[PDB]
Design a protein around this ligand. Structure first.
Ligand SMILES: [Cl-]
Length: 8
């Protein structure tokens, strides 16, 4: 979930 936010 933390990577999801950063990538987005
Ligand atoms: Cl961006």
């Amino acid at each position: 979930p933390x990577a999801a936010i950063i990538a987005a």
